[PDB]
Structure formats: C-alpha cells, structure tokens
Amino acid sequence: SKPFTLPILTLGELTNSRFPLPIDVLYTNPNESAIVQCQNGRCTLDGELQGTTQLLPTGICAFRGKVTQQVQDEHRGTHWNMTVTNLNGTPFDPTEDVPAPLGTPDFSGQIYGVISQRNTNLPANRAHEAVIATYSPKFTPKLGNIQFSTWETQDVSSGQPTKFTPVGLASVDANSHFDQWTLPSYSGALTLNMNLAPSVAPVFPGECLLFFRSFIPLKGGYGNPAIDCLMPQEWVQHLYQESAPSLSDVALVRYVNPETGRTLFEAKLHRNGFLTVARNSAGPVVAPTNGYFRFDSWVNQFYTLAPM
Amino acid sequence: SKPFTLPILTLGELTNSRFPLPIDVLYTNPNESAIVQCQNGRCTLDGELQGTTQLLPTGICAFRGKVTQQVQDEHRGTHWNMTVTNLNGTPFDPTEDVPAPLGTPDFSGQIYGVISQRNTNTVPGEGNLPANRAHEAVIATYSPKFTPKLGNIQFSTWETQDVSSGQPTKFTPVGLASVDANSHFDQWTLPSYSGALTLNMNLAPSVAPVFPGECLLFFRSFIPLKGGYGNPAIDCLMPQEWVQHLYQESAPSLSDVALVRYVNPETGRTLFEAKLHRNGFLTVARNSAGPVVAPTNGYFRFDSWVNQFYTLAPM
Numbered sequence: 065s066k067p068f069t070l071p072i073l074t075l076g077e078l079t080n081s082r083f084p085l086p087i088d089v090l091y092t093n094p095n096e097s098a099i100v101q102c103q104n105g106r107c108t109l110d111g112e113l114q115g116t117t118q119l120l121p122t123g124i125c126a127f128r129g130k131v132t133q134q135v136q137d138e139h140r141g142t143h144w145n146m147t148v149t150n151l152n153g154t155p156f157d158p159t160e161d162v163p164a165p166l167g168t169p170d171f172s173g174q175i176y177g178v179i180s181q182r183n184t185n186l187p188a189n190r191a192h193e194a195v196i197a198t199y200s201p202k203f204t205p206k207l208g209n210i211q212f213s214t215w216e217t218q219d220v221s222s223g224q225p226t227k228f229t230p231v232g233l234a235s236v237d238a239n240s241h242f243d244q245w246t247l248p249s250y251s252g253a254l255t256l257n258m259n260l261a262p263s264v265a266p267v268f269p270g271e272c273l274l275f276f277r278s279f280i281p282l283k284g285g286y287g288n289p290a291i292d293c294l295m296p297q298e299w300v301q302h303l304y305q306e307s308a309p310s311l312s313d314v315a316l317v318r319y320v321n322p323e324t325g326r327t328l329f330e331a332k333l334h335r336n337g338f339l340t341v342a343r344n345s346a347g348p349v350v351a352p353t354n355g356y357f358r359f360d361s362w363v364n365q366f367y368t369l370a371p372m
Numbered sequence: 373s374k375p376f377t378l379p380i381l382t383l384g385e386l387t388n389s390r391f392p393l394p395i396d397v398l399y400t401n402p403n404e405s406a407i408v409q410c411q412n413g414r415c416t417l418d419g420e421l422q423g424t425t426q427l428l429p430t431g432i433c434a435f436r437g438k439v440t441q442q443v444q445d446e447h448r449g450t451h452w453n454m455t456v457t458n459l460n461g462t463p464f465d466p467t468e469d470v471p472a473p474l475g476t477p478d479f480s481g482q483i484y485g486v487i488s489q490r491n492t493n494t495v496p497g498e499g500n501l502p503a504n505r506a507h508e509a510v511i512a513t514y515s516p517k518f519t520p521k522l523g524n525i526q527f528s529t530w531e532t533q534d535v536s537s538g539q540p541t542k543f544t545p546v547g548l549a550s551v552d553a554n555s556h557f558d559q560w561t562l563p564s565y566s567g568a569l570t571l572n573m574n575l576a577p578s579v580a581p582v583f584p585g586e587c588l589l590f591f592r593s594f595i596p597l598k599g600g601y602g603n604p605a606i607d608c609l610m611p612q613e614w615v616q617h618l619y620q621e622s623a624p625s626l627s628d629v630a631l632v633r634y635v636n637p638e639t640g641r642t643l644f645e646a647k648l649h650r651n652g653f654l655t656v657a658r659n660s661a662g663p664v665v666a667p668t669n670g671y672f673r674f675d676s677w678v679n680q681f682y683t684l685a686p687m
C-alpha cells in the first residue's frame with residue numbers, strides 16, 4: 065500500500081495555491097468568523113483535485129478568452145466584456161461538474177493584473193493594466209463571461225486572444241469588497257454556486273486551522289493584505305502525482321528543523337486537505353523558513369495534538 | 373540506488389522554467405547558431421541546481437529590493453535605480469558562487485512587468501497600515517545599468533513620479549515590452565550580470581547534442597508583448613516541475629544519458645524517444661525545425677539508463 069508522503073520543500077521553497085505568490089509565513093486565526101471554503105488549493109490526501117483547483121502555478125487566478133464589448137464606466141475607467149474558455153483554450157462546458165473554469169479566483173475583491181492580446185491575423189500585440197471585480201454582477205465565469213476594467217480607454221481589441229496575468233489587488237478600502245473567505249457568485253448573484261469543495265474546520269476542541277500565508281501586492285491605497293491557503297501549490301502537485309491511499313481520516317505531521325532534527329510542533333493533516341494545530345492565539349508562527357512538514361503516522365479525530 | 377524517475381505530467385500540466393508561462397509545445401531547431409547556455413531551469417539529473425536556478429515558479433525573472441532614486445537615462449521613459457536582494461529578502465552576497473541572485477533573467481531583452489511597493493513605515497491614522505503603489509515597468513537586461521551581480525538594476529516606467537525612494541519593491545514579470553530590432557531580444561544571449569565588459573562567472577555549462585543527427589528538444593512557451601508585432605517564444609531545457617522533482621528525489625545518475633519515451637497513455641504507445649542527458653537536457657533524432665505535433669496529454673517516461681553509443685529511433 066503506497067506510503068503517504070509530503071514533499072521535502074521548505075517554507076521558502078513553497079508557493080501559494082490561491083494566488084501566484086511565495087509562501088511568507090505559517091499563520092493561525094482561531095477567532096475567524098467566516099466559513100472557510102476556498103476553491104483553489106483544494107486536493108484530498110489521496111490526490112483528488114476539488115473546487116476550481118488545477119495544477120499550473122500560472123493558472124491560479126488566470127483567465128483566457130476574447131473581448132466582445134466595450135462599455136464606459138459611469139465615472140472613471142472602461143469596462144470590457146470577455147468570454148472565457150478553459151485555460152487550455154478549449155471551450156468551457158458549463159455542464160461539467162466544476163464551480164467555474166479551473167483557475168478562476170475564489171474570493172471577493174478587485175484583482176489587479178495585466179490583460180495582454182496577440183492577434184490571430186507577424187501578429188499585432190497590446191497589453192494594459194486591468195482590474196477584475198469578482199463581486200460584480202458581471203463576474204459570471206460559470207456562464208462563460210466576465211468583465212474587466214482598464215485605465216486605458218480604447219486600445220483593447222475585440223475578437224482576439226486575450227490573457228489575464230494576475231499581479232495583486234487594486235485596493236482593500238471599504239468600497240473594494242476584499243474578503244478572502246467570501247466566494248464569488250460564479251453564475252451571478254441570484255444563482256447558487258455548485259460543485260464546491262467542502263468547507264473546512266477543526267472538529268477537536270482547542271484546535272484551529274493552520275494556513276500558509278502570502279502577502280499580496282496592492283496597486284494603491286493603504287493596507288497589508290494577505291491570502292491564506294490550506295496547502296501550497298507544490299503539495300497539490302505532489303498529492304496528485306502520488307495518489308497514495310489515505311489509511312485514516314487524519315495524518316499526524318511534524319514540523320521539523322533538519323539542522324537539529326528537532327520537532328518544532330505537530331499538526332493534524334486532514335483527509336480533505338487541510339491542517340489543524342493546537343494553538344489558542346492568532347498570528348504568524350515564528351519558525352525557520354528551512355523547516356518543513358514530515359508525515360509521522362495515521363491517527364484519528366480523537367488524537368490530542370501537543371500544544372504549540 | 374534510488375531509482376530515477378520523472379513526474380507524470382502532461383504538457384498541459386507543465387510550466388516554463390525560464391519565464392512564468394505554461395508550456396505550449398515541444399520544439400526543435402537543429403540549425404540554431406547560438407550557444408545554448410541558459411541559466412534558469414538548470415538542474416542535473418541527480419538534483420543539483422545550477423546557474424541562477426531556484427525552485428519557486430514565482431521567482432523566475434522576479435526581483436526584490438528597494439528603489440533608491442530616480443535616475444537619468446537616454447532612453448524613453450522615467451528611470452529608477454533599485455538595489456536587489458535575494459528573493460527571500462536576505463542581502464545578496466556577491467562572493468557566493470552564483471552568476472547573479474537566483475531567479476535573475478537569463479536572456480537579453482526588455483522584460484515587461486509590474487513594480488509594486490509596500491512601505492515600511494505605517495500610518496497610525498490608517499490603522500497602522502502602510503501605503504502602496506504599483507506601475508508597469510520595463511527592465512532592459514542588456515543595459516549597462518543591469519548589474520544584478522553587483523546588487524542593483526534599473527527599471528523604467530511610464531508613470532513619471534509615483535515610485536517611492538527607500539521603500540520595499542517587488543518586480544512581477546509579465547512578458548516583453550517589444551521585440552523590435554532596437555529592443556535586443558535574444559533568448560540565447562546572456563546578460564552581463566556585473567555590467568558591460570565584465571565576464572560572467574559560475575555559469576551552468578552550455579548544452580548540445582553529441583551524436584550526429586540529433587538536436588536539442590525544448591519545452592516552448594509563447595511570451596506576451598506590451599506592444600508591437602511579434603510572436604516571441606522562450607525555450608527551456610526542462611520544465612520547472614522537472615527541476616522541482618529532480619531536486620527532491622536526488623536519484624543517483626547511473627550513466628550519462630537516460631532513455632526516455634514520450635507516451636500517449638490512452639494507447640500506451642510510444643510516440644517518440646529521446647535522450648535525457650546528465651546535465652539536464654533532451655536530444656532527439658530529428659532533422660527539422662518547428663513544433664512537435666503530439667497530444668498535450670502525452671508525457672515522458674523513464675525507460676532505462678543507456679551509454680554513449682545508443683542510436684535513437686528517428687521521430
């Protein structure tokens with residue numbers, strides 16, 4: 065029976081599965097009131113991708129498609145409607161059992177990046193800064209179309225292959241609706257999201273979720289926003305490759321310093337693909353960025369973790 | 373000996389190790405005249421990273437540092453000097469045996485992306501939070517001001533004033549600014565990491581076929597353009613996921629060449645075979661240039677270690 069394993073990449077060798085960023089710190093927040101139900105970076109321990117999760121680091125919060133219409137904003141900026149395909153360029157089939165095209169953003173906010181185009185008919189090219197408001201009524205990726213806005217007023221071509229490269233957030237002020245745990249309405253506001261990866265939570269008292277946290281760039285304004293993922297992208301890729309059978313619902317993992325061999329703390333790695341620790345405080349976990357998680361053994365829901 | 377393995381990823385599940393792009397096609401060009409000596413995506417089969425190669429997909433062609441001041445330059449735009457650190461924020465030690473900070477671009481051109489800043493100082497009235505800004509930027513890697521091995525580079529912006537001196541700065545690559553003649557795009561020309569007229573050091577070695585009839589096989593991605601005409605591409609020797617896998621496994625290399633087969637798993641039939649060389653590159657028996665037309669659900673499978681006398685089946 066294929067033994068379960070995690071990669072031997074250190075924190076400084078891991079990337080976020082919910083936005084294209086390095087992992088900066090491990091992090092807890094026991095008093096979080098939101099339901100944690102992100103859709104990228106979702107993979108079971110036996111290698112089943114869930115939600116909108118796909119394997120490419122370049123596909124996280126990316127879109128591919130074509131522009132079909134230009135509409136000027138009531139105040140400032142220009143909006144462009146974009147039909148979206150699968151990231152591999154094949155048409156998106158709304159009947160497939162996914163919430164949205166794989167790679168679609170899984171949080172409410174104004175996502176800042178670059179739209180680029182390379183024409184079909186050597187080809188002409190253009191690129192501009194762009195913002196995608198995932199809370200907008202026009203954010204309907206499950207129906208095959210989204211809207212982006214630009215500061216550029218005219219030089220975006222219709223009917224030509226278009227790529228969105230995410231870079232960060234446009235703003236986190238009150239009017240920008242940034243909330244990392246609020247899912248977009250993938251089909252628009254009056255329609256239920258479907259085919260979601262399940263919510264995650266600790267089930268044992270005194271435990272809290274452990275996140276891999278990355279700080280996300282901002283186009284302007286004040287803030288130090290972060291995106292927390294349940295497992296880094298390299299873990300998604302590893303679990304998918306190995307497809308090792310899960311022998312219980314909960315694996316015990318140890319965070320180790322290899323310099324010393326000492327265990328710094330232990331955690332539960334749950335079958336659905338998330339970590340819990342026994343910690344009663346919020347904030348970063350102070351540890352070397354050369355530490356890493358090692359699988360110890362399968363345990364069960366009733367195992368008592370050593371406190372952090 | 374731990375058996376050598378490759379990951380089981382189709383072309384559509386792989387990314388480029390020289391720029392943050394998906395792999396689009398496999399590609400050959402037997403008549404290439406340049407020396408192929410790229411410095412990102414360099415890893416031996418037993419897991420030794422070489423050149424400027426590092427493991428993060430977000431680190432490829434990225435920079436981290438601080439803007440110092442606005443500077444004058446003959447070229448169009450507004451220009452800024454920035455010191456560069458290691459990507460993990462620690463100071464870059466020029467005495468380390470590397471060509472430049474890991475992740476530094478390994479080709480001549482005008483690299484287009486976004487510079488972003490998050491200030492160190494916070495404002496009590498803003499909830500004790502820092503101010504931020506981001507703007508499009510271009511780094512000309514052929515410029516005499518591109519001196520990452522000395523710990524500083526220059527970038528240009530269309531924005532004329534809203535870049536802050538002394539503040540932490542990140543460069544996120546997106547594509548190229550141009551591939552016109554005056555933009556000096558050449559994927560096989562290395563930057564001068566310490567400036568004009570200095571010799572680059574600590575380089576990963578050049579790669580080439582040894583056997584007649586063989587040519588290099590590349591993983592090709594098409595790179596976006598800010599403007600102008602073109603369909604530029606970046607060719608890597610192995611995808612970033614192979615770098616990551618080889619690094620993890622560190623399997624001993626039992627000869628100088630591994631025989632690999634590109635397989636369609638649906639039929640289990642081999643589409644073609646290739647040599648995977650110890651230093652981390654592929655060759656095939658092909659006498660044409662251009663894409664390899666095969667399913668993007670195909671993948672390479674390790675078959676066996678072979679010796680210097682193996683003749684590959686023509687593709």
Ligand SMILES: C[C@@H]1O[C@@H](O[C@H]2[C@H](O[C@H]3[C@H](O)[C@@H](O)[C@@H](O)O[C@@H]3CO)O[C@H](CO)[C@H](O)[C@@H]2O)[C@@H](O)[C@H](O)[C@@H]1O
Pocket residue numbers: 234235236237283284285286503504505534
């Ligand atoms: C804090 C400063 O941010 C930028 O100022 C620009 C300003 O940014 C505003 C955002 O557009 C808005 O969404 C929200 O986040 O508030 C920001 C200001 O607090 O926008 C105007 C245009 O309306 C200008 O572009 C300002 O420069 C940044 O550019 C500054 O350098 C500051 O960091």
